[PDB]
Structures are given as C-alpha cells and as structure tokens.
From a paper:
The rate of HisR was not affected by buffer composition (PO4 or Tris), ions (SO42−, Mg2+, and EDTA), or the PLP inhibitor hydroxylamine; however, the enzyme activity was hindered by iodoacetamide and Hg2+, which are known inhibitors of enzymes with catalytic thiols. The DapF-like fold is an overall α+β structure, in which the monomer unit is composed of two structurally equivalent N-terminal and C-terminal domains.
Mutation of an active site cysteine to serine is a common strategy to aid crystallization of cofactor-independent epimerases and racemases, and likely aids the process because this mutation slows catalysis and helps to keep the enzyme in the open conformation. In each structure, a sulfate (mutant C67S) or a phosphate (mutant C209S) is found in the active site directly between catalytic residues. Catalytic residues 67 and 209 reside at the N-terminal ends of central α-helices 2 and 4, allowing for stabilization of the negative charge formed on cysteine thiolates by helix dipoles during the reaction. The position of the loops above the active site spanning from residues 42 to 49 (N-terminal domain) and 197 to 206 (C-terminal domain) in HisR more closely match the conformation of the open C. glutamicum structure than the substrate-bound, closed form. CntK and other enzymes with a DapF-like fold are typically functional as homodimers, and HisR appears to maintain this feature.
Numbering used by the authors:
A (entry chain B): 4 to 265
B (entry chain A): 4 to 109, 111 to 264
The structure:
C-alpha cells in the first residue's frame, strides 16, 4: 500500500524542514514516517513537522524554533491577506505558550524573515574541564555547550565531544549540543548528540544553539544582538526586554505530494 | 554486654574526630557504633575513624583530610622520636595513594599537620537566577562557592534550595556550599546529604577549603591563604600543581569508651 501525504519543503536558515499537512498529528506512525521522509533517498530534510490549523506537531514532539519559523512562513505564504508583514499566532509541541511570530517578506513571495520568541535559559556556566574553557547554557531539555576555538588551544572537534560526554557521564541527559564557535567570523558549526540513538550530527542551523551562543555572548561581551553565520544559513539572536528572540531567513522550496511505502 | 573501645578525641580544625584504636576496621557494625559515639549524649564528634597500623578507616569508607591530619598528629603525639617536625606516611580509606603528612609542634598536645589533598575534576562559575556561584567538582562531592559580598543580599537557605534545584537532574551523593566572605577570608561550610536527607553547617571542612582554594587560584591567583571557619581555621597551599591543607590539631582526650 502507498501512502500519499501533502508536504511543504522549507529552508529555515538551512535546517531543511518538511511540513506534512492534512494528516493526523497523533498517528503513532509519525516517527517511522518522518524517518523514511528525511532520507537522502527521499525528500531529504533535517526536520519533519505535522501541521494542523495553527499547531506544529514535530516528529519528536519537541519544540523547534526553525520548524516553527518555517511553519509561520507557510501561513503567510498561504494567507491571501498577507502583504509585507504579519504576526501569526502558532502553537508548537513542547511549548505550552502561544508563539507570536513576526513574519516579514524577504523580497520574493517564497522568501521570508521569521522572528520567534525562544525559551529562556535556566543557567549559564563557564566550565573549566581538562585544559579547555567551555560555555554552558542549560535549557529545559537541551544542554548547549560553547567552544571558542580561538580562546582555546588546538583540538579535534571529536575530542571536545568526548570531553563533554565524559562531563555528563553522571548527568541524566537525553541530548546535548556543542557550538564550535569562531570569534573572527562570528561563525558557528552546531553539533548535536542523542543518547537514545547514540550518535552525533553536525547540523546546518540551530535556533536553540544560536540562542545559547547569544546568552553566552551577552555575559562575556555584552552583545545584545548579532547575526551568527552557520554552515548552510544564518540566524540572529535578539535580546530585548530581558527576552530572547531568533530571527532568520525562510524559503518555501517545494509543495505537493509525497509517496511513502507503508 | 557492653563494648569497651580505646579512643582518642582530637580537634582537627574544629572537625571533632574520635579515633578508635585496636578494633577490626572491617567490622560491619562500625557504622552503627560510630553513629552512637558521635551523639551529643555520648563522646560527641563530627567524624569517627578506626585505626590499624598506620591505616585509617573512616566509618563510611570515605577520605577526610582533617581526620587524616588528626591521625598523623596522633602518631607524633605517641612518638618519642618526634620534635618540631616529623613526616608520617599514613593511609586513609577511599584513597589508595600513600599520604605524607608534615606534622609539626604548635605544647605537647598541639600540632600542625599538612596533607596532600585530592585534585578537582572541573572548575566552573554558574550564573543561575540572579546569583554567581563557583562550583568545584571532585570525585564524590561537588563544592559550591557562594561569595556573599560579590553576590546580592540573600538567605543561606535560599542558596541551598537553589543548589538543590540545580542538581535535580544530576546524580550526586552529597554537596557542600562554602558561604564565603571575601573581606575576612572566612567561610561557613555547609553540607547536604541526599543519601541521608539532611544538612549541617560544619565547624570546618578540609575538602571545602580546597574547593575555595581552587576557586581563588583561578579568580585571584592566590596560591595559599588562611580560611577562618566557624570554630577553626585551615590553610590551603597550592605548590607545583598540587593541593595541600595545613591547620591546627589538638589531642583532646585519651581513654576508654563504653557502648551498649
């Protein structure tokens, strides 16, 4: 049997997102479904969501700032009343608060700029393990470590990953991120690890990571706003009225039907 | 039936230690016995350790720099070859490495004992809520550092409830909070054990004094300082990438104790 699903492919700052539509968000087939979708042998993406009215049910039931930005940019794309700017109220899995996204046109009708209010950090640390100084911005769900390659000495990105892993060996964590940060170019190579899957992936973008880097830059350099270049995209962290926002580009790539093997 | 044990009550920097001599260090009743000895209705102590030939076995198999300092000062007290200084190589539970203690005279029952202390795993500076806390993490304990003067007005209990919140997601056996006064270079060591669900403001803490020493080496580049504690004082000394604790030890009493 062949399953046909409405899809929208989107590039939110490089974190490619497939947004399935007109589907049951509670379907237990969501995880395996999104798994086959994301393959390079299929509609290749880095995140998969499931739209319904104004709610975004991610594949993992978690909150994603980029997939939420992609979603809000779809409403504008599909809203006949949208002109050049509009605020779109949306809800997202893993976030009880209603998210008000400021969606602006970025030139074309498929290009957008989406500013979303990102969760607040629980704590901000500066750990000194081994011979390296590392940042840490603990969140509800993700621990985001920072690594100023410049301030630190020579090392493989792998070494800093095994060092952070050994650091959390006594800490019940489900996933951590490490932001290998270059201060000369304000660039950042986000990395993420998960225990359940037991692997690591270098991502093209990271809304939450950019938030972490922003928190660590406001404490260490008093930068309230800046654009963070990332592998295949860029984001901008914004601290206004003691609150964190992420702004960045969003491009509607494709629209149509996908054929999955049940 | 009543147990008769030989005891030496000592005052290591205020961390009252009863050392029980001529006893099976492998006895499984040691826990209960120590519990009963430490009561204020009995001999009274903050730590209890049992002694074989140059070996010191804590009640909980832990390492205690102060109790080990007391043990070394006892050997000097009972050694007629001891003068203004002698080095005694002792061992302590929870620490395989042999420990060279520099025991000196301070009276015949007053001493000064310098012992090498465990190395830290990582040093940090958390910024949770609106507080800046230091955190030195050792093997088995995590010593927080709360600079009262550099932080804002707060209750001690507040910082305790806060630190607990920080470790909610972390698996730990116990944590100490070194409430630090930068002006007088004094601190009020506190210690919580989730394994026993209770907190105690100690008269002194050796491990805590190393934590603050590590924290003061990174922040102010201080190698050695005297840290006054509620009822005692210890001196941390960092030399050649090693941590030491010096301080006063007084032999209080010798004799026999009776336990049922």
């Amino acid at each position: 049997k062949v399953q046909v699903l409405d899809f929208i492919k989107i590039n939110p700052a490089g974190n490619i997102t497939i947004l399935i539509d007109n589907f049951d968000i509670y379907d237990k087939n969501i995880p395996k479904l999104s798994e086959e979708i994301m393959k390079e042998t299929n509609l290749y993406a880095e995140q998969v969501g499931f739209i319904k009215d104004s709610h975004l049910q991610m594949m993992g039931g978690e909150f994603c700032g980029n997939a939420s930005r992609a979603f809000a940019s779809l409403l504008a794309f599909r809203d006949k009343d949208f002109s050049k700017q509009k605020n779109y109220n949306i809800t997202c899995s893993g976030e009880s608060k209603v998210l008000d996204v400021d969606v602006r046109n970025d030139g074309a009708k498929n290009k957008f700029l989406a500013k979303i209010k990102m969760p607040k950090f629980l704590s901000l640390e500066e750990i000194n393990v081994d011979e390296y100084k590392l940042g840490l911005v603990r969140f509800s769900g993700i621990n985001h470590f920072i690594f100023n390659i410049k301030e630190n000495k020579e090392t493989s990105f792998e070494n800093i990953i095994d060092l952070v892993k050994k650091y959390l060996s006594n800490e019940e964590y489900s996933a951590f991120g490490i932001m290998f940060f270059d201060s000369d170019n304000l660039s950042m190579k986000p990395y993420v690890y998960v225990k359940e899957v037991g692997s690591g992936v270098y991502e093209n973008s990271s809304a939450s990571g950019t938030t972490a880097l922003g928190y660590y830059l406001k404490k260490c350099k008093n930068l309230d706003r800046a654009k963070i270049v990332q592998p295949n995209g860029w984001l901008e962290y914004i601290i206004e009225n003691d609150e964190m926002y992420i702004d960045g580009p969003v491009e509607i790539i494709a629209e149509g039907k996908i054929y999955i093997g049940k």
